Each structure stands twice: as structure tokens, then as C-alpha cells.
Amino acid sequence: ELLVFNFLLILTILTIWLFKNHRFRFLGAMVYGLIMGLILRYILEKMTFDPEIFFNVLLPPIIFHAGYSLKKRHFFQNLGSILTYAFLGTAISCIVIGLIMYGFVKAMVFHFTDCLFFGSLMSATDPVTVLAIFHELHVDPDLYTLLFGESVLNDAVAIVLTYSISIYSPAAFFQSVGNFLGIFAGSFAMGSAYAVVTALLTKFTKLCEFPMLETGLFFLLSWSAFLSAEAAGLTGIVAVLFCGVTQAHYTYNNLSLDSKMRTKQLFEFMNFLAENVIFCYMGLALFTFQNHIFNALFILGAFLAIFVARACNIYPLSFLLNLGPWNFQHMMMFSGLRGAIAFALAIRDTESQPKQMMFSTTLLLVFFTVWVFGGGTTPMLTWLQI
Amino acid sequence: ELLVFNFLLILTILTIWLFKNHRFRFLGAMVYGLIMGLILRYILEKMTFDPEIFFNVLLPPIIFHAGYSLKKRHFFQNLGSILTYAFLGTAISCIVIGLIMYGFVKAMVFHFTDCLFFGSLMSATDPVTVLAIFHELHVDPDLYTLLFGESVLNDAVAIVLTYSISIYSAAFFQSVGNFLGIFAGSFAMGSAYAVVTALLTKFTKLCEFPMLETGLFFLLSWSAFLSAEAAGLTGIVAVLFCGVTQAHYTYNNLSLDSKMRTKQLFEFMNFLAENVIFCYMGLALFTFQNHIFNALFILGAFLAIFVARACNIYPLSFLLNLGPWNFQHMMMFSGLRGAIAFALAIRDTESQPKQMMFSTTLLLVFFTVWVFGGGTTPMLTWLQI
């Protein structure tokens, strides 16, 4: 680990500059996959030692910022739509499996549980680049709130849902579903339990006179909720921390007026370290030789599956919502990226199943392919209508 | 390990809690480690797995903030004294070894090179307790701006000096060159990133992206530490300490927004120094193979503490006065011992069980100087403001 980190820093500086360099260019760190990966084909494995456990512990700060940055324009305005699209992840999973199951069976003219696992893994959808474009343009506030709320909810559903599948064992159907309800409900109550303590502590006691103390305890109490998830054995540790959204609505507004900017900037800095997650796609795209060894030509079934499965269950859900506005257009625009979280699930022990290794191969190619939607977002906006 | 890191926060929360109430009490977090240890003394080793190499990677942010928090009121009047205090750490190691040589030779009624490690280790001194009291009371600014100097200067000297003895065994001739070469090399490449950081944003307009430059500042500052260890140049904490030029040049150039953000970002990590302050007690109750020795050399080390702080500053005091100083601050220099000295005490901890007694003594030294550090207010009021 001496110079292993140093590889990240040099390209990160390039990533920092390209944001200021390519400010008006036609067009992130996604480009450097060909640059940094290829030059080191000829010490080699030490670049991507990267224990899969470590990735999970550095992701919670990324998603905690998402839950702590709500502009409070959806708690009562479009909350129902987000909760309606919370069930979309179940719809996404049940449709992706319906196609990829026929994909490998007809490819050979291996089991079925990985197909269920793959569908849950693919259910994540976090278009980070798309959300960044919307906010800076200072337009379509309703459209911005739609994608942001959906992207921060399905991933929380995806992580808990894929855990239930991984522990499913064939009656035996109910307890696997019961785990999904029990863990998610436990994550909401226990996760917010530490958040409630922070809110009342800073609202009754006049602790706002000590900016250093309030900021320190806020980070520790938020971190303790994430840490308490593993200690109690309740999974969905990201969801546990993500359920600290009440901190931004109640704890944030108590009495500080000074650490308000200090707290958001602190977690924004950790949120700004997402390029380490981004580079991990391409840095390990060639270093993980044992992972991408297969590169089987089954991606064509996956390619067609991801495009239609997301599209074929967003209009019907909106149609159900139309029963009780929506511009009849945003549903088509919803087709964004395929989530940063999905990569983390693809590296879960990396050896649980032969075709499971192929999942990581498919995910990497999709990421280098789905990003054209982010690049091709502006023509999509101007194609028919805004 | 998942639950081990959890209970390290509740006692850190209590650290925040104690300072909320202790704004008027007679007087902090140093004792919470013992309280948790006693409860856990009655699964056990997993609390203090704590690889010793990982201790030296969470420590540099403490050093960087110390070098980044200079008040710029010491280099103009007390710089010569502070630079002369770099020899204090060297002469301390020269006298401590002789005092500790008689500690065991006369007691018997290891090897000499092992005693050198302990002597150089004592040169480190980080009186965080005294400095905290000074700033909050707004007292003796002249003494504060120079006491901070030696406090961090010898820490950079201590780490390189205790590493230089690795070649000691006619091998003593190149030791001085190796010590000076590494220290000089640390200043060159360590401050080079600060120069690179300064010129990068002095010409370009990074003010439109205050968030981008903050990451770049952290990325560039971290690179200096990482590049030193990767290239084999030791004194990595000293290399990051050479980031004081970041405050001299980069801090004041054009930011006007991230200046407070950068200070608060690093001081928050420096505000998490209690983790260093908490690591001792867990190892002081569970690692019976390491700390249980506690041989009857504590008093010998205890006597060596005061004389080392007295037999060295006093001879140098006359030289500095030759070119006022009121002749009073010299007696006050009998201060704390710090926390970086522990990081040297945990250098692989596996020389010999009979030789590892020095680590046991150092833990007691912090406890004995904690109450001594606590009883600082009577000393301050007695002499002068």
C-alpha cells in the first residue's frame, strides 16, 4: 500500500483539472480507462488489491450526502411518485430475470438463483452525470426532483433486495420476503433512532455555541448509526445510514446557523471522492484478470434486457399514477445511467458462481456503454421536446 | 472488528460531552480509556488489533495541521531560538542514554544500541494540554509562539534521529550525514509540492471552483507524504511537516472561500487526535505479554525526565541570551511529554520481551505527566502571565 494510493492521486489531479479544462468542451474520470489501464500491461496486481469489504465502507459517505442534500421539494409534492417507483425495483428485478433467463438457456441451446441475483443487481439506477447537468442549468425543477428521488431510493431497495435473494434457499418463500420487510423496517427505525438523538440533543441544550463540538458529534453519531448496523447483525447498512435523511430536515435546522455550512461541506468533500469509485471500474477493468477472464458473448441478451426492462415498466407505473399532470414526457426522459452502486454488488466475493464472474464483465462494458446516454443527454433534450 | 470500531465512538462522544460541561469545573479525555478498559477487563484482543503501521498513517494529519496552524509571528523574532531548539532533541538523547545506562547496569549488581532508541524517543514533546490552556486564556503570546516551535520541531527530529540509529553498530561516521541528508531531502521534496501547489493556482483562477481546489490541496498535500514513503525517503511525518510553506504561499493567494474550509477540514482531523490519546489504555490492560512487565525502572526514568528537560535547556539558555528573555520562561519549559512519542514506542514491539520494558515505562510517563500537566495553573499564576 506504499505507492498503491499514489496511482490514484496523479490521475485524480487530471480529473480535477478536466472539470476546469473541459468546461466548454463537447465531452469525468471515465476517459482514463484506456490511458491508465493499458500502459501497465507489462507490482501489477498490487494496484487493485482493494478488498471488496473496503469498497462498502467508503460508499456510505457518498449516499449519506444524497440523503442530506434534499431540497425539501418532494416530501409532500412528489413523495407518492418516488414511493410508487420504490416498487419499480421489484418490477425491474422481475422483468430482467424474465429475459436473461431465456438468454443463457438459448445461448447453449449454472443455476437460476444467479439470474435472480443478476436482476436485483441490475435494478440499481443512479445517473450521477444526468443529475449534475440538470442542477447547473437552473431549469426543469420538477424533472430534476423526479430523477434525484428515484435514484436515491431504488439503490436502497436494490441492496436489501439482492441480500434476500442471496440468502434464499428452497414453504421457504415467506421468510425470504419477511427478511426484506424486516431488515428494511429495522433499517428505517434503528437508523433514524440515532438521528433522533442528535436532533433533540442540539435543540434543547445550547450546544450551538461550540461549532467544533457540534460538528464532531454529528459525524460520530451519524457514523455510529452506520456502525451499529453491522454490530446488531442487521444488513442494509447503507440504507441504515441513508435513513438519516431526517437529519437534514430536523437536526440540520435546530440551532446551528454556523455549522450548517461546515457539515454540508465536510460530507461534500467525501462525496467529491466518488472518482475513486468511478476509477475503480476502469482501474480494475484490466488488473482483475481472474475476474474478467471469461468475457463471454452473452452480453447481447443482457444488452437488450436492460434497455426494454426499464422502459417497459415505467410507463405502466405512470399510467397507474395517471388514474389518480406528469407532462406525459418525463417517463421517456427517465432513461439515464445504470447506477454507481451496481458495480459494488458485482464484486461480492467475485467467485460465488461461474457465471457470476461474467456479471462483472457485463457490468464494466455496460458502464462504458451507458455513459453515452449522459453524453447524448443534450440531444435527447433537444430531440423532440424539453 | 465491526463492533470494535463502534465503542471507540461512545467514549469519543463522551469526550465531546465533557468539554460541553467542563467550561467552569476545576479540571480530560485521557482517563476515559482506563474507564473503558476496566469495564472490559472483567473478543478481548480484537479491541486493540490496531496494526502499528496503520498508526503512522492517521498521525500525519495531526502534524500537517500543526504545521498549517503557525501564527506567522515566530519566524521573525524567535526563529533563531526555535532553530537552536532543534539541537535540544539531540542533546537530550545524549544525556538520557547515560542516565539510563546506569539504570540497569547498577541494578543488576539487551544491548547499548537499544538504550539509544529510548533516549532519542524522549526527545519528542507535544504539550497539547499546555498549549490548549494558553490560547483559551489569551496569555503569554510571546511564550506561546515559541513553545509551539520546539514542540513540533523536535518531533520531526525525533522520528528521523531514531531511524538513523538503524545503521549504528566505524558505522557512526555516516550516521550524521544520513540524518542530515534525509532531513534536508525531506525539506526539498516536501516543500516542492507546496511550490507546485502555489504556482498552479497563483496564475490560474481557481476561485471560481472553491470545491475543486480544496480537493486538489488535499490531493497535493497527501501526495507529498505518499511520495516520500514510496521513494524510500523516511521522516514522512517530517515531510508533511514541511507543508508549512503551504500556509506561507498557497493559503493566502486567491481562495477567500476555501481558506476557512481547508483549515476546518484539517483541524477536524486534528480534532480527532483522541484516537491517538485512546490507543494506550486498551493495550495497557489486554496485552499482558507486552505491558505487564513494569519493572522497577519507572523511578529511574522518572528522574531522567526532569534532568533531561533541565540539563539541556539551561546551558543553551546562556547562549541564546548572549545573542533579555526575563530568565523566567526557562523554568517553565518543564512541560508535557506528548503523544508522538508513543508512535515510536510501537515500532514493531517485538525486539525482546525483556527489552520491551521501555514501552511499559512510557505509558506510565504519560500518566505521571498528565497530573503534572493538570497542575499547570498553579505554576502559571506563580511565575507570570
Residue numbers in the entry:
A (entry chain B): 23 to 49, 54 to 68, 123 to 189, 199 to 259, 269 to 422, 428 to 489
B (entry chain A): 23 to 49, 54 to 68, 123 to 189, 199 to 258, 269 to 422, 428 to 489
Q: What did the publication describing this PDB structure actually write?
A:
NHE9* sample preparation was optimized for grid preparation, cryo‐EM data acquisition and structural determination at an active pH of 7.5. We combined 3D classes from two independent data collections of ~ 1.4 million particles, from which an EM map was reconstructed to 3.5 Å according to the gold‐standard Fourier shell correlation (FSC) 0.143 criterion, which used ~ 5% of the total collected particles. The EM maps were well resolved for the TMs, but a few of the connecting loop residues and a larger, extracellular loop of 52 residues, located between TM2 and TM3, could not be built. Surprisingly, there was no obvious density for any of the 90‐residue long C‐terminal tail regulatory domain (CTD), likely a result of its predicted dynamics and intrinsic disorder. The NHE9* construct contains 97 residues of the C‐terminal regulatory domain (blue‐dotted circle), but no corresponding additional density was apparent as compared to the NHE9 ΔCTD density maps. Despite extensive efforts, we were unable to obtain any structural information for the regulatory domain of NHE9. It, therefore, seems unlikely that the C‐terminal tail in NHE9 interacts tightly with the transporter module in the absence of binding partners. As model building revealed only minor differences between NHE9* and NHE9 ΔCTD structures, the later was used for all subsequent analysis due to its moderately better resolution. Superimposition of NHE9* (wheat) and NHE9 ΔCTD (core transport domains (blue), dimerization domains (orange), linker helices (grey)) structures, which show only small differences in the most mobile regions.
Na+/H+ exchangers (NHEs) are ancient membrane‐bound nanomachines that work to regulate intracellular pH, sodium levels and cell volume. Here, we report the cryogenic electron microscopy structure of NHE isoform 9 (SLC9A9) from Equus caballus at 3.2 Å resolution, an endosomal isoform highly expressed in the brain and associated with autism spectrum (ASD) and attention deficit hyperactivity (ADHD) disorders. Despite low sequence identity, the NHE9 architecture and ion‐binding site are remarkably similar to distantly related bacterial Na+/H+ antiporters with 13 transmembrane segments. The NHE9 monomer consists of 13 TMs with an extracellular N‐terminus and intracellular C‐terminus.
